[PDB]
Amino acid sequence: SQVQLVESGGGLVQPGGSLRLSCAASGFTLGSRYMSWVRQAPGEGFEWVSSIEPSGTAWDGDSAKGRFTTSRDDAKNTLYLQMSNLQPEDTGVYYCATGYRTDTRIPGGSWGQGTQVTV
Amino acid sequence: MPFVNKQFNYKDPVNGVDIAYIKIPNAGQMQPVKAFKIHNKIWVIPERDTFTNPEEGDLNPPPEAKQVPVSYYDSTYLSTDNEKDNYLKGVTKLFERIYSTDLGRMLLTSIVRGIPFWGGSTIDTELKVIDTNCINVIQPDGSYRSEELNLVIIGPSADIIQFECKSFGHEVLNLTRNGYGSTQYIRFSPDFTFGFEESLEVDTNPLLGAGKFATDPAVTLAHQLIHAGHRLYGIAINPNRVFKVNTNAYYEMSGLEVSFEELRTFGGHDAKFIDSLQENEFRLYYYNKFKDIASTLNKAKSIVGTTASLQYMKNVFKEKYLLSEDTSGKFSVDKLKFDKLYKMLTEIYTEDNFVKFFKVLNAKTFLNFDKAVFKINIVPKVNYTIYDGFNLRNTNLAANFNGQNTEINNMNFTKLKNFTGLFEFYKLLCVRGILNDLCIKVNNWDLFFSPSEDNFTNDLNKGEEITSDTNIEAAEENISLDLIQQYYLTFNFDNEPENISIENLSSDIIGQLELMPNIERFPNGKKYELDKYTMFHYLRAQEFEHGKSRIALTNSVNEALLNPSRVYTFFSSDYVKKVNKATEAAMFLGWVEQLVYDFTDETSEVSTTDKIADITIIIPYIGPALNIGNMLYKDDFVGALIFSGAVILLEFIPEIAIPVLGTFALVSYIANKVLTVQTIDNALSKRNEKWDEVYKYIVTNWLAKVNTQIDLIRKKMKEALENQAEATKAIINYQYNQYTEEEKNNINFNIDDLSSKLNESINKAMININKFLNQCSVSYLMNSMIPYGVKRLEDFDASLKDALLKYIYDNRGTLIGQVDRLKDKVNNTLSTDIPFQLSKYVDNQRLLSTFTEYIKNIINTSILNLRYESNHLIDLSRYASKINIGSKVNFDPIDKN
Amino acid sequence: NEERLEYNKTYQLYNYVFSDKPICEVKQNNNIYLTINNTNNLNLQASKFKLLSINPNKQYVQKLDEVIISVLDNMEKYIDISEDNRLQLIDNKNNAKKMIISNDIFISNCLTLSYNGKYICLSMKDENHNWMICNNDMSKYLYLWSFKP
Amino acid sequence: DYINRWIFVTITNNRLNNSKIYINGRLIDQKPISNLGNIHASNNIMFKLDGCRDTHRYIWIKYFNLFDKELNEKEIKDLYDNQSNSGILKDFWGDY
Ligand SMILES: [Ca+2]
Ligand SMILES: [Zn+2]
């Protein structure tokens, strides 16, 4: 087929306890690529959230270090993001993206459709 | 024709080709960094390097100061996307500056085709790449592509100004010493440079600026690119090969670490510190390494982990190692081809030679130590350009290296604080009750370099067997701009190796850096008890701290060392009395004039001697200035020099150890006339070499043990002269500030103008001192060293004469009819001496270059030189002043000047 | 040999930088150029040169003289400058370029050659061949030549 | 030796001592300048006849230099010799 990425998470709790985001991949083996999480707040640019290596190693940006832990399940071919201690400045649509430190729409990259989060 | 054909900006988004997040080999997990491929096989990562070596990942100053003379620590440096964008642009500009030179254009090309050998295969029928010689380029789609590279420039570690080549190793192989080569990681920054002191150029540039000069960062990068070049070709000298020094004596350095590799890289005189025997050892070592690579290639029947062909690959390495390929496809190494290549990599690519190309002020030797660190910005063209560096054409900055003078060009250089402390590493020298001990601390890099005797090894005492066949090593000519031009015009710029598709490596590439040997931190604050004031004391006594109090000059070293307001001078007591006197305001200017005159007079003093051969002039005040030798009157110094020769200048008398030379043994050929006569000729040819070898050896021991002492004495005399100027200025400035506002208002007194005048006087003085000290050093060579060699050589000629005659007579049967003619050849040849000619072994001594400097000196003092050239009347001076020509000016058609 | 350079005398031409390598002629596209032999014994023949003066009475060559360079191959060929500033041997003396010969005061056995202020030197590696070119931007050493008889 | 002939002029200035004028390489006259204070000269140098009442007057001039030191006797003579163009014959006036 092709490359498909689909996020799943509800994104509603007032400040602020926890949420687990999900990304289901198809067309490729998830664990063979560098993946990233990135959010776009209403009326504003992209911010790099998280990144996960093939080796399973996870790097997180200034935003949500000591808060979020990026994870994977290879059999289920799904990228997980575990958020905690959420605040109002964490609101926006959360995309699961294709690169490392993906900040931007880059030709050749793949994305999800987006997942809403209001805190 | 630029080296970097894209102009990158750090915020440009990753394309997966020349801009990407990449993984370098590492021991454990490594966080991907943003890199830029500026040229084929060459990448730049604008990041402080904590990734290369996870062990040292913290950018803070260490618990114990490094034992270098200069260091700088700022953890925040290069943490910003703006600084990253500037690093990238600066590094790029330096690459372009280097490339724009003939020498740099070769070096850069050599580095690119210097692809690390494929030695990965444990099965010799197959050719495989070595993993740590590659990186993983992360694509936008999340996949990585494995790609091989020669060179990566990365930001510095915790010590911002410490630049070096790093590379990864192999379980067994030494890739930098086996000719294989390994991908090179250089820690570098274009955002800082070193300050240094230079007194030598005053001969050709009498207007040379005062104070510190800044190293042109392009030289510094080039220096590292040269190391990189060695390491890529696997010819680097083992890091455990080091030049040992003597640290035990009060005047000697506490310790100094310098390696044969570094000596090789610096070039010039530094590289002549390594004797012929050892230089030979290396050439042969790497030649055999090259020969091994030939046999590895010859037995490789297939390629692995690429879509490229064994043909193409074998050809890549044929072009890297200059292999000869016969009709069958077998590889070997031509000693002629190899000699040429190894020579280019180690004698042509040298810091010394780059300086010749850049035309910048630079330390002539590593023994001229960096005294300071400076923040710079080379990215703006108004600051630093590809063609001119800091010294910008058609401006004041083009003259006398002003672009590099930190005070004249002060907007381009900001003084940072040296992290290496005041007297961080020193020795403590104490005179005994001349009343109790008066001790002073001496900076380690203010002490004497005294090379260990086990540094100079020779086979001179080994005999040889002369043979009908035995044949002659060539002249071994010195490196010169025209030889370089020879390499240049024969150099091949066409074929760069392709960037090939290679089988994907694992996501993380496993490897560690080559281990560097652990060096003992040398001892600190060793104390010494002395009976007599030393040179270090005499110089220290010439210093003062700034303050509101009026200092006075004294002719008593003791007084000066004992009191903060007392500064020692080697000037006459008349000068002392005059500079100290309280001066009425109405007489102040005339007073200053007299002081400036007296200063210039006393420092310009030169006594000529007609008594001795190699030393024409003597500067008498050197005696009381440095306490050279001993006793009192400067007439003692002039006298002692004339009597004892140059040896009175030396801090230590060097050992020159020249043994009984190994005699020749001739193989006899019965009944063969032609062979017997060739053997005789060969023994005579090798005899001429024995003379050249002994001369090279002594010249080598002299550069290291003697000429370095004289170079120190010289540097100290400039320090002495500058101290005297500072003292005199301070006293004059104190007198001026004693006046009333009204008195001052009637005295136009400009301390900067006075300073400028005294700095010119110091330059004139250094010109003389320089000539005197050069003649002194050379005189010691001619008179105190060479003769030991000539005695050993004449004894050798005598033994050979007896041997050769015995050989002729024993062979009179074969040699019949020729016996008399051969006797004469032997007796006449061996009764001559081969005269030592210094110009043959070192660069600066040719006769013509003396006249050359004189012409330069007058041309560099011309601030307007107005000539008619081409179609216009212009200024040929480096200032390039504008000329406006009226409509009625007429030019003689026959001669338009 | 530091003997006076003579007009109408046969010399071989050498560049200061490769002192043992004589100038030789090589044709490219139905016309003929001047190079040196970097392929050891490629059996290019050392080319034979003769300096000519507009004045029949002139014997010895002096600083600032105007000169025509000739060669004996089959007929007599005379030197011209191409549009690429590469020197070539041609058929017609009329088209021959008149060059100014001079010398360095400190190099006793060597000479320099110029046209319209543009000096003559050796080009970068090409074929491999290094062409005689009229260009002002190379290293000073490449502008020194000497004639050996 | 002078009238309508090329002359070589050299003036040297030692602010601590003397102002010196040379003709054809030789010292002619010297005057003490050490009583002179700060000298601030022009941002330009003007070659032109200023104040000459002879309308037919003119001058020839060549090889003008300005030096940042006081030239000594030796340098002045060497200068004089070097610039005389000894490779070309001269007429009485000093022209080629
Ligand atoms: Ca004192
Ligand atoms: Zn180095």
- Ligand found nearest the CA of B552: 1
Gaps in chain C following residue numbers (C to N > 2.5 A): none
B734 close to B553: Cβ distance less than 8 angstroms: no
Beta carbons within 10 angstroms of residue A14's beta carbon? 9
Question: Domain count of chain A?
Answer: 1
* Residue B314 in tokens: 């074998």
Neighbours of chain A (3+ CB pairs under 8 A): B
SS3 content of chain C, % helix, strand, coil (to 5): 5, 45, 50
B528: which strand partners?
A: B429
Residue-range definition of the domain harbouring residue A17: 1-119
CB-based contacts of B738, cutoff 8 Å, min separation 6: none
Distance B366 CA to ligand 2 centre (A): 10
Look-up of token digits 């200063």: B599
Coil, strand or helix at C133: strand
Using alpha carbons only, what angle is made at residue B9 by residues B3 and B15, rounded to the nearest 5 degrees? 85
Question: Which of B202, B594, B864, B882 to probe the D interface (max D CBs under 10 A)?
Answer: B864
Distance from CA of B51 to the nearest CA of A (A): 14
Minimal CA–CA distance to B566: which of B589, B736, B423, B579?
B579
**Which residue in B57, B48, B99 sits closest to B76, CA to CA?**
B48
Measured distance CA(A83)–CA(C119) in Å, rounded? 75
**In this structure, what CATH number is given to the domain that contains residue B168?**
3.90.1240.10
* Out of B102, B485, B870, closest to residue C17 by CB: B485
- Picking from D75, D16, D33, the residue whose alpha carbon sits closest to that of residue B601 is D16
The answer to whether residues B805 and B676 belong to one domain is yes
Residue ranges of alpha helices (H) inside A15-71 are none
- CA B391 to centroid of ligand 2, rounded, Å: 25
CATH number at residue A82: 2.60.40.10
**From the CA of B598, how far away is ligand 1's center (Å)?**
22
C-alpha–C-alpha distance, residues B713 and B637, integer Å = 15
Please state the separation of Cα C59 from the chain's center in Å: 19
Contact (Cβ atoms closer than 8 angstroms) between residue B91 and residue B189:
no
CA distance B274 to B763: 33
Query: Helices B819-829 and B786-810: crossing angle, nearest 10°?
Result: 170
Q: What is the largest CA-CA distance in chain D?
A: 46
- Distance CA(A103)–CA(B81), nearest Å, equals 14
Q: Which domains does chain C have, with CATH numbers?
A: 1-149 (2.80.10.50)
Residue type, B15: N
Query: Are B339 and B456 within one domain?
Result: no
B338/B423 same-domain check: yes
3-state per-residue secondary structure call for B430-479: EECCCCCCEEEEEEHHHCECCECHHHCCCCCCCCEEECCCCCCCCCCCCC
Residue type at position B93: K
Chain B residues with CB inside 8 Å of D60's CB? Answer: 892
Contacts for B154 with CB less than 8 Å, ≥ 6 apart: B44, B45, B47, B49, B51, B52, B185, B186, B187, B188
The C-alpha atoms of residue B446 and residue B369 are separated, in whole angstroms, by 9
Checking B608-612 for CB contacts under 8 A at 24+ apart, the result is B609/B638, B609/B642, B611/B642, B612/B642, B612/B645
Return phi, psi of residue C114, to 5°: -135, 155
Residues of chain C with Cβ-Cβ distance to B492 below 8 Å are 125, 128
Only one residue has tokens 């044709």, namely: C27
Contact criterion met (CB < 8 Å) for C18 and B486: yes
State yes or no: B262 annotated in a binding site: yes
Whether residues B288 and B379 share a domain: the answer is: yes
- Residues in contact with B378: Cβ distance below 8 Å, sequence separation at least 6, in sequence order: B90, B93, B94, B190, B217, B384
Distance CA B260, CA B273 (A): 9
Do the annotations mark residue B496 as ligand-binding? no
* CA angle, residues A93, A96, A98, in degrees to nearest 5: 135
**Which residues lie at CB < 5 A from ion ligand 2?**
B 262
A74-111 as b/e: b if 16+ CB within 10 A: eeebbbbbebeebeeebbbbbbbbbbbbbbeebeebbb
Chain A CA closest to residue B504: A32
Chains D and B touch (3+ CB pairs under 8 A): yes
User: Do A23 and A9 contact (CB within 8 A), yes or no?
Assistant: no
Query: Which residues, 6 or more positions from C43, have their beta carbon under 8 angstroms from its beta carbon?
Result: none
b/e string for B353-392 if b means 16 or more Cβ within 10 A?
bbbbbbebbbbbbbbbbbbbbbbbbbbeeebbbbebbbbb
CB atoms within 10 A of CB D6: 14
Range of the domain at B603: 438-469+529-829
Among B473, B860, B539, which residue's Cα sits nearest to residue B712?
A: B539
User: Could you tell me the sign of the dihedral formed by the alpha carbons of B620, B626, B632, B638, in that order?
Assistant: negative
The sign of the dihedral angle between the CA atoms of B804, B806, B812, B814 is negative
Nearest to B861 among D37, D64, D68 (CB): D68
3-state secondary structure C19-35: CCCEEEEEECCCCEEEE
Q: Are B684 and B829 in contact (CB under 8 A)?
A: yes
What residues contact B231, with CB distance under 8 A and at least 6 apart?
B165, B167, B175, B176, B181, B182, B184
Rounded CA Rg of chain D: 16
- B301 and B239 share a domain? yes
CA angle B476, B481, B484 (to 5 degrees): 70
CATH number for the domain harbouring residue B823: 1.20.1120.10
3-state secondary structure B329-340: CCEECCHHHHHH
Nearest-neighbour CA in chain A from B9: distance (Å): 16
Please name the method used to determine this structure: X-ray
Nearest to B767 by CA among B597, B634, B571, B603: B603
* Sign of the four-CA dihedral B4, B10, B16, B20: positive
Distance from CA of A92 to the nearest CA of B (A): 23
C-alpha distances in angstroms, B131 versus B51, B119, B290, B312, B633?
17, 10, 21, 20, 71
Q: Scan for tokens 């740590």, then name that residue.
A: B132
Please answer whether residues B654 and B708 qualify as being in contact, where contact means their C-beta atoms are separated by less than 8 angstroms.
no
Q: How many whole angstroms from B163 Cα to the centroid of ligand 2?
A: 8
State the distance between the two ends of chain A, measured CA to CA, in whole angstroms: 36
Burial class (CB in 10 A: 0-12, 13-18, 19+), B744: middle
Contact B767, B202 (CB under 8 A): yes
Rounded to 10°, the helix B276-298/B310-321 angle is: 170
Let me know: does B197 contact B258? Beta carbons within 8 Å. Answer: no
Q: Which residue has the tokens 């330390």?
A: B363
Please state, as a whole number, how many other Cβ atoms lie within 10 Å of the Cβ of residue C27: 10
User: What is the chain B residue with the closest CA to C105?
Assistant: B848
**Encoding tokens for residue B306?**
């690429």
- How many A from CA of B262 to the centre of ligand 2? 5
Q: Is B55 annotated as a binding residue?
A: no
d(CA B576, CA D28): 37
B443 and B428 inside one domain: no
Nearest to B259 by CA among B491, B516, B568, B624: B516
Amino acid at the residue B543? E
Q: Can you tell me the distance from the alpha carbon of B685 to that of B468, in angstroms, rounded to the nearest whole number?
A: 12
Spatial separation of the C-alpha atoms in residues B374 and B72, rounded to whole Å: 10
Chain C: residue whose CA lies nearest to B491 = C125
* B581-595: burial string, b at 16+ Cβ within 10 Å, e else: eebebeebbebbebb
* Nearest-angstrom CA–CA distance, B775 and B119: 54
Residues B20 and B137 in one domain: yes
**Å from CA of B146 to ligand 1 middle:** 66
The span from the CA of B209 to the CA of B390, in Å, is: 14
Closest CA to B262 of B179, B187, B163: B163
CA B817 to chain centre: 58
SS3 of B86-136: the string is: HHHHHHHHHHHHHHCCHHHHHHHHHHHCCCCCCCCCCCCCEECCCHHHEEE
Residue with tokens 């729409």: A105
Burial C56-66 (b: 16+ CB within 10 A, else e): eeeeebeeebe
Mutate which of D66, D73, D76, D83 to disrupt the B interface (most B C-beta within 10 Å)? Answer: D66
Residues of C in contact with B870 (CB under 8 A): 117
For the record, the structure tokens of B759 come out as: 């700095």
The shortest C-alpha distance from D28 to chain B (Å) reads 22
Bridge partners (DSSP) of residue A59 are A51
Task: Describe the strand order of the beta sheet including A116-117 as a list of residue ranges.
Answer: A58-60, A46-52, A35-40, A92-97, A116-117
CA-based angle D50:D55:D56, to the nearest 5? Answer: 115
Which ligand is in closest contact with the Cα of B351? 2
Hey, are the CB atoms on B489 and C17 less than 8 Å from each other? yes
Q: Any CB–CB contact under 8 A between C142 and chain B?
A: yes
Of C17, C106, C124, the CB nearest to B482: C17
Tokens representing B265? 């890289």
Is it the case that chain A and chain B have 3 or more CB pairs lying under 8 Å apart? yes
Q: Pairing relation of β-strands B42-48 and B151-155?
A: parallel
Would you call B896 an interface residue with chain D, using a CB distance cutoff of 8 Å? no
What would the 3-class secondary structure string for B541-592 be?
Answer: CCCCCCCCCCCEEECCHHHHHHCCCEEECCCCHHHHHHHHCCCCHHHHHHHH
Helix axes B102-112, B217-233, angle to 10 degrees: 40
Residue A100 alpha carbon to ligand 1 centre in Å: 64
Q: Which of B298, B318, B285, B325 is nearest to B115 (CA)?
A: B318
Nearest alpha-carbon partner for B599 in B574, B567, B627: B574
Inter-residue contact A64 to A9 (CB < 8 Å): no
To one decimal, the resolution in angstroms is: 2.7
Identity of the amino acid at B5? N
Q: Are residues B322 and B443 in the same domain?
A: no
- Please state the separation of Cα B783 from the chain's center in Å: 28
Q: How far is C18 from chain B (nearest CA, A)?
A: 7
B513 touches chain D (CB under 8 A): no
Between the alpha carbon of residue B211 and those of residues B611, B720, B762, B772, the distances in Å are: 38, 14, 12, 23
Strands (DSSP E) along B612-671, which ranges?
Answer: 617-618, 664-666
Q: Do B864 and D45 touch (CB under 8 A)?
A: yes
Residue with tokens 């300073």: B755
Are B452 and B397 members of one domain? no
Write the residue in B102, B486, B493 that is nearest to C17 by C-beta: B486
Do residues B717 and B625 touch, judged by C-beta distance below 8 A? Answer: yes
The encoded tokens of residue C139 equal: 């290293």
Q: Are B575 and B569 in contact (CB under 8 A)?
A: yes
Cβ contacts of A35 on chain B, cutoff 8 Å = 142
Sole residue written with tokens 């216009």: B872
B811/B805 Cα distance (integer angstroms): 10
* Same domain flag for B420 and B446: no
Ligand found nearest the CA of B542 = 1
- Which residues, at least 6 apart from C140, have a Cβ–Cβ distance to it below 8 Å? none
B424 and B443, same domain (yes or no): no
Distances (CA, A) of B370 to B61, B225, B362, B376, B705: 20, 20, 11, 16, 21
Contact by Cβ (8 Å): B289, B173: no
Sequence-separated (6 or more) residues with CB below 8 Å from residue B268? B350, B351, B352, B364, B365, B843
Amino acid at B241: R
The CA B556 to ligand 1 mean position distance, Å, reads 10
- Asked if D69's CB is within 8 angstroms of B206's CB, the reply is yes
Strand order in the sheet with A78-84: A4-8, A18-26, A78-84, A69-73
Distance B223 CA to ligand 2 centre (A): 6
Q: Does A98 touch chain B (CB under 8 A)?
A: yes
A and C adjacent (3 or more CB pairs under 8 angstroms): no
Residue B117's closest CA among B39, B178, B167? B178
> Which residue from B640, B603, B600 is spatially nearest to B776, judged by alpha carbons?
B640
The Cα–Cα gap between B592 and B597 comes to 8
Distance to chain D for B372, nearest Cα, Å: 30
B251 contacts B220 by C-beta, under 8 angstroms? no
Residues B580 and B595 in one domain: yes
Closest CA to B485 of B844, B107, B843, B103: B103
